[PDB]
Design a protein around this ligand. Sequence first.
Ligand code: CLA
Ligand code: CLA
Ligand code: CLA
Ligand code: CLA
Ligand code: CLA
Ligand code: CLA
Ligand SMILES: CC1=C(/C=C/C(C)=C/C=C/C(C)=C/C=C/C=C(C)/C=C/C=C(C)/C=C/C2=C(C)CCCC2(C)C)C(C)(C)CCC1
Ligand SMILES: CC1=C(/C=C/C(C)=C/C=C/C(C)=C/C=C/C=C(C)/C=C/C=C(C)/C=C/C2=C(C)CCCC2(C)C)C(C)(C)CCC1
Ligand SMILES: CC1=C(\C=C/C(C)=C/C=C/C(C)=C/C=C/C=C(C)/C=C/C=C(C)/C=C/C2=C(C)CCCC2(C)C)C(C)(C)CCC1
Lengths: 137, 340, 335, 35, 32, 82, 447
Amino acid sequence: AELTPEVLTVPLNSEGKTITLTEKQYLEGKRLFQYACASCHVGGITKTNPSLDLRTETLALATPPRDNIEGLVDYMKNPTTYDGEQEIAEVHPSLRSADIFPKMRNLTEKDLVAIAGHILVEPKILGDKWGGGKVYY
Amino acid sequence: GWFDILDDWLKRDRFVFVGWSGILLFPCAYLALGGWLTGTTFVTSWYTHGLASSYLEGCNFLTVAVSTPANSMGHSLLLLWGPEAQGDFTRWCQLGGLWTFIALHGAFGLIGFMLRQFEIARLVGVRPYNAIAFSAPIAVFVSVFLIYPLGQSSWFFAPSFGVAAIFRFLLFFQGFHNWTLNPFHMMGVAGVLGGALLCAIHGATVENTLFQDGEGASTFRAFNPTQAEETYSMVTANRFWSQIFGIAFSNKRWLHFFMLFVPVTGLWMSAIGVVGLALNLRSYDFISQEIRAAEDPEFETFYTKNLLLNEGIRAWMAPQDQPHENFVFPEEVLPRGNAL
Amino acid sequence: SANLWERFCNWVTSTDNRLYVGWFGVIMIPTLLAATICFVIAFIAAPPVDIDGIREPVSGSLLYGNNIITGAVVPSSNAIGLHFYPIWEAASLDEWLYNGGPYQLIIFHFLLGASCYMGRQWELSYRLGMRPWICVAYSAPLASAFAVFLIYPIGQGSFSDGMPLGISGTFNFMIVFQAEHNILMHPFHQLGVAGVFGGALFCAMHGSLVTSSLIRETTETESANYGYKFGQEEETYNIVAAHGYFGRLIFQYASFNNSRSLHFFLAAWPVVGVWFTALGISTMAFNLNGFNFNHSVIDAKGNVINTWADIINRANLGMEVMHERNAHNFPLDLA
Amino acid sequence: VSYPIFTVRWVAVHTLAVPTIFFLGAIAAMQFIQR
Amino acid sequence: METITYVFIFACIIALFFFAIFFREPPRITKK
Amino acid sequence: GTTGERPFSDIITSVRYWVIHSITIPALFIAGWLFVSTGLAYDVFGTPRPDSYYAQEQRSIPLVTDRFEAKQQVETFLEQLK
Amino acid sequence: DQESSGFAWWAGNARLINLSGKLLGAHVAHAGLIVFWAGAMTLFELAHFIPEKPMYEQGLILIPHIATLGWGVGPGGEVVDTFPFFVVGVVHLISSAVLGFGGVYHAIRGPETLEEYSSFFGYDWKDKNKMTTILGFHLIVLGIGALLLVAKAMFFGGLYDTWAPGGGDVRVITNPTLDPRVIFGYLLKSPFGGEGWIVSVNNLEDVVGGHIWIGLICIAGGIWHILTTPFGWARRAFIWSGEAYLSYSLGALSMMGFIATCFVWFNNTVYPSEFYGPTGPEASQAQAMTFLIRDQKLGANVGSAQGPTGLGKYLMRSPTGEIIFGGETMRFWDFRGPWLEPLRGPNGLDLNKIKNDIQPWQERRAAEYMTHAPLGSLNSVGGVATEINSVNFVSPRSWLATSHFVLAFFFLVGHLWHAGRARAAAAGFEKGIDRESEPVLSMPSLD
Ligand code: CLA
Ligand code: CLA
Ligand code: CLA
Ligand code: CLA
Ligand code: CLA
Ligand code: CLA
Ligand SMILES: CC1=C(/C=C/C(C)=C/C=C/C(C)=C/C=C/C=C(C)/C=C/C=C(C)/C=C/C2=C(C)CCCC2(C)C)C(C)(C)CCC1
Ligand SMILES: CC1=C(/C=C/C(C)=C/C=C/C(C)=C/C=C/C=C(C)/C=C/C=C(C)/C=C/C2=C(C)CCCC2(C)C)C(C)(C)CCC1
Ligand SMILES: CC1=C(\C=C/C(C)=C/C=C/C(C)=C/C=C/C=C(C)/C=C/C=C(C)/C=C/C2=C(C)CCCC2(C)C)C(C)(C)CCC1
């Protein structure tokens, strides 16, 4: 019962290719997730919009696909609606709006990959907890 | 005779009085406290409750506990050499053998202690009203940690020895038994709350009706350890309360017995109520209320409100609080208000 | 007449009154009479009150289907919040009774008088030449009334969230409090029960010890109480025999021999403990709640290993999720 | 006076003191366990 | 019927309160 | 107001006491420390190590379900690398 | 000099009641501790302070006090220069050494009494003239301090105005409200819902203006006391003793401790939500905003939406008719805030501005304040008591309010204690009832 690299192997892109994170990246992502996400995304939900969660399946049915490193990283730079037919960087933290969301100023490409990895690894560990809310607490 | 020489030694006035009672008190009293402090830091509750319960696992002073045995054990005494543990110590620990250890030992420790009160009182030649008083904490422990689970399915539903583990015991009784609505419990708090009043008010009354027996402001030194005159004006205290409250004592002997009666009587009433909770004979509902509420959907009291809270408590807690039942409550079946 | 006003002040301050009407009494007596009279009438005949401001009236009076245990005086409406709602602020009494008008009239009058009651507990002590501080002991239960009836509503932004004036209504106040604040896991509360448990403990301690060490002056078939006369010179119990016994129960130096150090401890312990419990409610009135150890201990992989603190959380959820059914429209309970 | 050493009080004192420190040492070490 | 019973007992307690305060036994000093 | 025992005040003050206890007290401490740090405590009380609550894949709890064959059932729970 | 034959050890400082010299040492050494904290804490906060991150998410309570005075901050409370923070911190920390020096000196070296070593500084508690005079000195010292704020606002830079026209920004106040009708009007305001008494101040003009009045009034009363003595009634009403004077000041701080608690909890102006967190009402208001904004974008007619009770899911009316936010947030309809006001009309929330004048900066502001409500645990875990560990946060508005209520209360206890003692000390029975002449025994039996 441990965090094996077998667990830290998450899909990199849409074309099946995967990437293996390290215990250093995980913790770092986890720390960065608290720094800039937890405020609204504590435990994989969304307080200011509970209809959309951070479940891998939810991210898979997003448009474009956000159930991989490439997807999520793109989102953290230029976020869109679930259908992608609208850019929401003005009312959502991102690189192209770091002036509006100061927390996003420090964040570097290394940081973005870590946070993305965290979102894909947590449900591998927590399961239903990561998606659901108080019901699974 | 060796007996009287054995007696001689025991009843010798030491720093820590032993006595005949000590032969029962000290062994149990030490093992119980020892058993707790052991389990508190080392032994787990994983195989019994699916819980971490020790410092070794990461629990703090609040979340630590010596959890009850599994529901599988039944009312088994869980002896180290019993059919369950089979002489094994490690197994004994993991099956919650430490609970029945602490419980049964502490029980006899409470017997020995009151016996000490009786024995010491006899020697000093004082009245055993300290022993009579101590019967209230006994009844409580007996009723709650023994009688109650003996009426239930197993030791599992007894209060687990630990801070947080007792908080769930309160909330459980609220959710399942509606314990707050029980007349016997109410007398209980009335005794405890009222006893904590007598304690305060009497202490304050005395300290602020004292005679001047010294020239310093700190009047503590100005007390005569060798009786004589009353250290505080009983006559002034009387006239005080008679004018601010309308009623006042005027008989220290009655005043002090009353201070014995109130909290001891209360604990005893709260005990009877728990004894009734053992057969699940609770004071859960008011039939006249339920009948109207059924026919009339606009009838609402603070009583009905509370019952809905119980429903929430039971549904959301039962799964992880009663693992042996293998509960599975779909999200849709979970009773919930709007939005929340 | 030596001077009407001069006589009046001499009458008020007079220590020869059956009940000492003080200068604080001039305010206490009327306010308490208004509080009690309004209460008694309300508890019996008041109509249902829309407590949560959601047009969902709660009946808490006897004549409207309640008994002593369920009955209560329902807190003012949530639509009113912290606004001042006297009788002359309503178009009619019907409206006033519907929005929980009586509640404010009672709690304000009670808290005012009960404060003056503390003020009077000083005054009489002053007029009789005895030491004060008795009122200081009474400051602890009063500060609890203040916290429960005023401070918490101020903090939460509404008097509807104050503790109801009834048995079952108080139980509601607690259960919900526990859900929203986790009061059982708060230091100040634990200190409260410690003061209250200890209080009852010590109350029995002292009580028993003393009455057990009474000097014999009574017959075998005569009340042991008669062995004391009101207005004695000497003591009625052997405090040296008491200390001798209790000193051997535990050990000598862990036993009191000073009556003044004893009674101070007897007063200090519960008063200080309740003081903290009163400060607990007043602190959790601004949402500084009890410890949150939810999902603390986790295993090597990251799986959440439950504690009793988590089992407590499940019970709390049930309370939260179910309390005030139709009052919530939005995910977070920030009110 | 010529006080003794080993007494009943000494025994009592040690039954609580000796394990305490042993536990205090054990618990102090747990503060460094991780995952 | 129930309401009557509740108020009745309550009224009896208040009545007792009255007598307890104003019709008590005069607390006599020394020579008692 | 006195008994046979030597007044604590004197002993806690005596140099001899500290000459003894500067050795004894830290000894117990280091002993208790080692008791945990060597992982011995884990085996004496069957307390699971951080990597010993579940199996790698399993997310179920090792709940004891019958009293008499409990010891045997527990041992089986340790089998699945738990 | 002083030992057990004066007071007990646990009442030691009461042995200094009549030791002017040493009693000065305490106050000067004590005064150092306050400056020491102020200094050492500021540097502690700065040492942890992260510029590109909200102040309320960092456990700051002193740097935001400085920010309010227009120092190191700019547009929208943006932190520009951390030097003024560094300065305010180090300067204090230094002055504490100076104060600490005098304190220690007067307490263990200097004259144990003052009356002889200088009749000007030496004093007598019963000397109604010296007392009113020393009181007069401090009444001026505090008076100048009040003008020290007026100067900083009008001349030396200004203050942080959240109500700034172009959006929250440091502004120089050059038009202080001096109208007594307006200023002292606040004192005549209700302390309940709506009319919020002193805490209801909502603009820096009144803040600066009022301090001008206070400053002058304070110094004026300061001169008055220098050149006068207590009247007739003033002497026949009060108790004149060292403890009595303490008690009066104890109850005074208690009252101010309570007023400060409600100020930091409710007020939006002198406690900017940019530096501190969002106020209690503000956050609940923000949630109604957030989801009104969301659902409306999904195509919902917020104006006509019917909630479970049939009251109005998003919008409803106040008891006096104003259009307000719906839900439990109906209790917080008295909230006013820069982000929300542009949506308000002459009758409350305008359905037209709500329908198409919602700005993006307001949406994310509401989202911000909604997800940063002053809810947290003792061990600092942000959210409801049932929340999960992740967000380590507790609103500064929560820390300050709770701490200062605890202090204010105990000080009300301290007041009663010292006021009760002074009365008994004066009349002379604070040490017990006279065994011989027992007052009660000379009064007729009421029985
Ligand atoms: C006098 C003090 C005292 C008392 C009253 C108890 C009481 C108890 N202990 Mg205990 N214990 C003590 C001191 C004491 N302990 C000490 C000092 C230690 C440290 C070594 C322990 C360590 C300990 C452990 C480790 C355990 C207990 C347990 C128990 C419980 C069950 C034990 C049992 O079945 O008793 C049996 C009773 C007797 C043997 C009394 C017999 C007396 C008769 C007169 C002798 C006859 C013998 C003769 C051969 C019979 C001939 C008949 C013929 C037909 C064969 C019981 C509540 C168990 C427990 O708590 O289970 C949950 C458990 O596992 N104890
Ligand atoms: C301006 C504030 C002020 C001032 C100048 C005084 C001054 C005085 N008080 Mg006093 N008092 C105050 C506020 C104040 N009080 C308040 C607010 C209370 C209510 C609690 C009291 C309650 C009080 C009592 C009950 C008594 C005095 C007494 C006295 C006199 C002797 C001083 C003394 O006992 O020191 C001795 C100081 C101590 C023993 C220190 C106590 C330590 C406290 C209780 C713990 C504080 C907790 C701390 C924050 C936690 C730290 C953590 C720790 C691990 C480090 C002196 C004239 C005594 C006297 O003779 O009456 C005239 C007396 O009996 N006061
Ligand atoms: C704000 C905290 C404070 C302050 C300022 C004082 C101040 C004072 N107390 Mg005191 N006291 C306090 C808290 C405080 N107390 C508390 C909490 C208790 C309860 C435990 C007491 C109990 C108490 C008693 C029982 C007595 C006093 C007395 C005194 C006075 C004489 C001091 C003395 O004997 O010097 C003795 C000095 C020393 C033994 C050396 C101490 C070292 C110095 C003072 C501290 C150095 C500070 C710093 C490290 C150096 C900076 C140097 C730098 C600037 C260069 C003095 C005015 C006495 C009195 O009434 O005066 C006649 C007295 O009898 N106090
Ligand atoms: C009274 C004003 C006050 C206020 C509002 C704050 C507020 C804050 N401080 Mg702070 N602090 C203060 C005074 C204050 N402090 C003082 C006087 C000191 C000097 C010791 C410090 C030293 C300090 C440090 C070193 C740090 C803070 C930090 C913080 C922040 C996190 C709070 C936290 O985690 O504390 C939680 C604290 C507790 C839960 C302890 C509560 C103790 C209570 C009051 C004890 C009551 C018991 C009672 C007195 C017993 C007596 C009874 C007996 C006599 C019978 C918060 C903004 C931290 C920070 O900025 O990080 C973000 C941080 O690292 N503070
Ligand atoms: C609460 C403040 C305070 C008060 C009332 C006193 C009072 C006293 N001190 Mg003293 N002192 C203090 C703080 C204080 N001190 C501090 C903080 C220190 C550390 C540096 C000292 C160090 C000290 C020493 C070393 C000595 C005294 C002495 C004395 C006594 C003789 C008067 C004197 O020296 O003044 C004479 C000086 C003046 C009258 C003028 C000073 C004016 C200064 C330079 C300007 C101050 C500016 C001020 C901060 C702003 C106010 C202006 C504002 C209204 C606009 C007198 C009882 C002496 C003593 O014990 O004799 C009995 C002595 O030898 N003090
Ligand atoms: C904090 C600073 C301070 C302090 C401690 C004092 C202290 C004193 N002043 Mg004073 N004064 C001050 C500042 C201060 N002054 C200032 C700044 C001015 C200029 C305006 C004055 C002008 C002044 C005059 C003109 C007189 C005094 C007098 C007095 C003495 C008697 C006061 C009295 O009996 O009041 C007791 C008060 C009452 C009996 C009235 C109670 C009714 C109150 C005001 C309303 C209820 C209060 C309520 C709870 C608070 C709510 C707020 C309200 C706005 C709603 C006393 C020594 C008198 C004296 O003896 O002359 C030397 C006197 O005649 N003062
Ligand atoms: C089980 C068992 C047993 C027993 C054993 C024992 C008996 C043990 C003991 C043990 C012990 C005997 C332990 C102890 C411990 C203790 C501790 C661990 C403590 C701690 C403490 C602390 C931590 C403190 C704290 C505090 C307080 C509380 C007060 C205030 C302050 C302070 C903080 C100081 C036997 C073998 C017989 C058999 C088998 C079973
Ligand atoms: C507007 C404003 C302001 C201002 C304010 C002011 C102006 C205030 C004032 C205030 C005041 C001006 C207060 C006062 C107070 C007073 C008092 C508080 C008093 C008291 C008194 C007493 C307490 C007394 C008592 C008594 C009696 C009555 C009888 C006889 C006996 C005795 C003495 C006990 C500010 C700045 C904030 C800011 C802006 C806004
Ligand atoms: C009388 C008395 C007392 C009290 C005392 C006191 C209260 C004292 C105070 C003292 C004090 C009040 C002190 C102070 C100090 C301060 C200082 C000494 C300062 C320092 C500073 C510095 C050193 C500088 C600088 C810096 C910076 C700028 C940054 C970097 C870091 C540093 C920090 C280096 C007692 C109770 C004990 C006992 C009895 C007697």
